[PDB]
Amino acid sequence: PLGSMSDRDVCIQRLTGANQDHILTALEHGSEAERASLTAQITNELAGVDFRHFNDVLRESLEISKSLAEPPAKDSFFDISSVDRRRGQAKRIKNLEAVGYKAIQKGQIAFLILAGGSGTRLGFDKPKGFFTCDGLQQRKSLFMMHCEKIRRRQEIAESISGSGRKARVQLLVMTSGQNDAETQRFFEENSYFGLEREQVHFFAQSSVPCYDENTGRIIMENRGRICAAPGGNGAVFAALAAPRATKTLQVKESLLQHLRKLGIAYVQIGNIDNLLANVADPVFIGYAIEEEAHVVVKTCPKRGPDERVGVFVRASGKWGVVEYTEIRAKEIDDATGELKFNCANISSNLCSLHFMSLAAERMKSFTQYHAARKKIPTIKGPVMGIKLEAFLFDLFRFVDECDHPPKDSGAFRIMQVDRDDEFGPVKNADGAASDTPADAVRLLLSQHTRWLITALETAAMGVDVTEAKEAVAVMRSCSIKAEISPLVSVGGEGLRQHLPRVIHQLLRNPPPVIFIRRDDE
Numbered sequence: 001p002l003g004s005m006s007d008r009d010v011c012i013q014r015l016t017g018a019n020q021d022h023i024l025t026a027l028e029h030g031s032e033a034e035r036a037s038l039t040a041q042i043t044n045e046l047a048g049v050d051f052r053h054f055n056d057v058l059r060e061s062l063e064i065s066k067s068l069a070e071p072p073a074k075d076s077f078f079d080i081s082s083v084d085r086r087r088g089q090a091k092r093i094k095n096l097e098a099v100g101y102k103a104i105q106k107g108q109i110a111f112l113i114l115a116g117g118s119g120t121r122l123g124f125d126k127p128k129g130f131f132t133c134d135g136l137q138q139r140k141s142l143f144m145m146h147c148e149k150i151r152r153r154q155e156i157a158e159s160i161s162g163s164g165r166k167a168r169v170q171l172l173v174m175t176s177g178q179n180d181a182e183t184q185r186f187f188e189e190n191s192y193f194g195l196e197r198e199q200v201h202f203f204a205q206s207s208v209p210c211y212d213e214n215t216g217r218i219i220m221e222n223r224g225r226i227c228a229a230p231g232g233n234g235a236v237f238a239a240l241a242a243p244r245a246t247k248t249l250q251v252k253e254s255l256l257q258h259l260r261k262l263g264i265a266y267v268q269i270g271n272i273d274n275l276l277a278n279v280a281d282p283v284f285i286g287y288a289i290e291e292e293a294h295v296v297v298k299t300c301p302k303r304g305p306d307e308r309v310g311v312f313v314r315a316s317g318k319w320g321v322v323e324y325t326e327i328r329a330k331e332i333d334d335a336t337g338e339l340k341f342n343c344a345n346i347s348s349n350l351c352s353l354h355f356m357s358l359a360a361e362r363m364k365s366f367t368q369y370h371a372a373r374k375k376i377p378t379i380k381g382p383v384m385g386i387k388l389e390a391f392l393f394d395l396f397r398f399v400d401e402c403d404h405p406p407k408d409s410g411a412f413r414i415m416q417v418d419r420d421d422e423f424g425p426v427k428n429a430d431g432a433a434s435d436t437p438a439d440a441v442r443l444l445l446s447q448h449t450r451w452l453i454t455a456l457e458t459a460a461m462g463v464d465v466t467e468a469k470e471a472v473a474v475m476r477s478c479s480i481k482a483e484i485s486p487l488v489s490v491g492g493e494g495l496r497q498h499l500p501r502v503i504h505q506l507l508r509n510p511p512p513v514i515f516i517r518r519d520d521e
């Protein structure tokens with residue numbers, strides 16, 4: 001009713017009565033340039049952040065960081081974590097896959113890419129989605145390969161349905177305030193990697209302030225900038241809640257509300273760093289649908305007892321993750337010889353839109369964040385401060401509140417998957433001990449190699465039976481690998497048509513890595 005307010009006046013309103021008066025002072029009485037940069041930061045990088053609420057978050061999170069957990073019951077979750085476990089369950093997997101494809105066709109699926117991180121650790125000062133792995137004949141960014149996986153899954157859904165309608169997965173790209181513009185530019189310059197512009201939604205997350213432990217004051221990086229840090233993937237809820245321009249222009253609604261109007265039923269969430277990400281996975285989707293789950297998490301067996309990864313647990317009937325620093329944890333089940341706590345968190349989730357909505361509502365009053373003491377660089381020298389994080393898993397305790405009444409068997413499910421098929425995070429520069437681009441590329445090639453050997457062996461049972469058999473023998477004894485474009489195959493399908501060329505190469509002059517791509521690439 002009082003009309004439009006300047007960005008600065010909105011910031012002033014947001015900081016009034018927030019117990020952070022040193023910031024309010026900077027906004028009201030700082031230099032022109034200081035007032036402006038602080039305004040831009042609080043507006044564009046901390047949009048929606050409730051500063052009073054975060055004082056409570058700091059207080060509680062500090063208290064918490066100063067034994068009820070039980071593992072998932074043996075044999076209680078869907079386990080497809082090896083070749084042998086998948087063989088024994090082949091029909092169930094195929095049936096779930098068909099359910100997932102129907103949902104993709106129906107336009108019910110969104111994929112949310114966590115895209116706030118940079119490639120700085122990889123030696124690349126651009127958003128991580130821009131990163132191009134060496135060692136691949138495809139010269140494609142991580143963003144490009146994600147989009148091609150969506151295109152392929154959409155194409156398969158259409159082939160199964162026979163529908164006249166296009167299968168469309170909504171792509172939600174969760175940027176940072178600082179990297180949003182450059183991310184949109186990259187997509188635009190590349191024609192959205194073959195996607196429709198209308199199915200791609202860019203939305204910026206908010207960072208979280210850092211605090212002095214003794215006083216609870218927000219730390220200043222400099223006179224024009226508060227100390228703030230990426231909040232962790234729990235930022236999704238606030239980010240999906242932010243009002244956006246809405247169409248005839250109407251009152252602003254959230255991306256969440258926009259998705260509900262588009263008929264989205266599930267949101268699959270994953271980090272852009274995962275080279276092996278099974279994007280729009282129809283088995284994951286089919287499992288959620290058939291289980292009537294509001295949350296499904298993907299997990300992997302631990303690599304060994306000392307792997308520094310969080311594991312899923314249930315405590316007092318509530319599901320969550322216990323991080324390696326907080327862990328009985330390394331006990332072995334007597335019968336199987338497997339760790340009792342053996343569902344490692346690979347940050348790959350599928351959530352109902354109802355859950356996304358309810359979790360966001362609950363999170364506004366939620367104060368149990370993860371606090372860490374960190375040395376923080378500032379223009380006045382380093383200081384010790386508190387950083388606060390929250391993760392998707394912190395909200396899973398609310399999952400059964402989505403049903404009235406809750407289901408007897410609950411609405412949370414675990415899907416234990418094969419790590420080497422599903423999880424290859426690109427996090428550390430080549431030459432590091434783990435999670436390097438080369439490590440992820442090795443897993444990718446190993447997976448494609450398995451798919452091609454399988455396709456060749458099926459043909460061994462149009463190409464000549466004996467030539468296919470000979471070609472497989474060449475693959476094995478020469479240790480030939482394959483690299484397969486997602487536009488060709490996302491799960492091992494679609495290779496039959498390529499076998500004449502593959503077989504010719506294998507029998508005449510095999511390269512170290514057979515490259516399979518669409519003719520029009």
Ligand SMILES: Cc1ccc2c(c1Br)[C@@](O)(CC(=O)c1ccc3c(c1)OCO3)C(=O)N2
Nearest residue numbers: 048049050231234235238241360363364390
């Ligand atoms: C749904 C929602 C809408 C607005 C706000 C919130 C939520 Br949740 C907050 O309570 C939390 C917030 O913005 C926030 C911002 C970044 C985060 C984060 C939470 O978890 C880790 O990363 C908040 O302070 N404002």
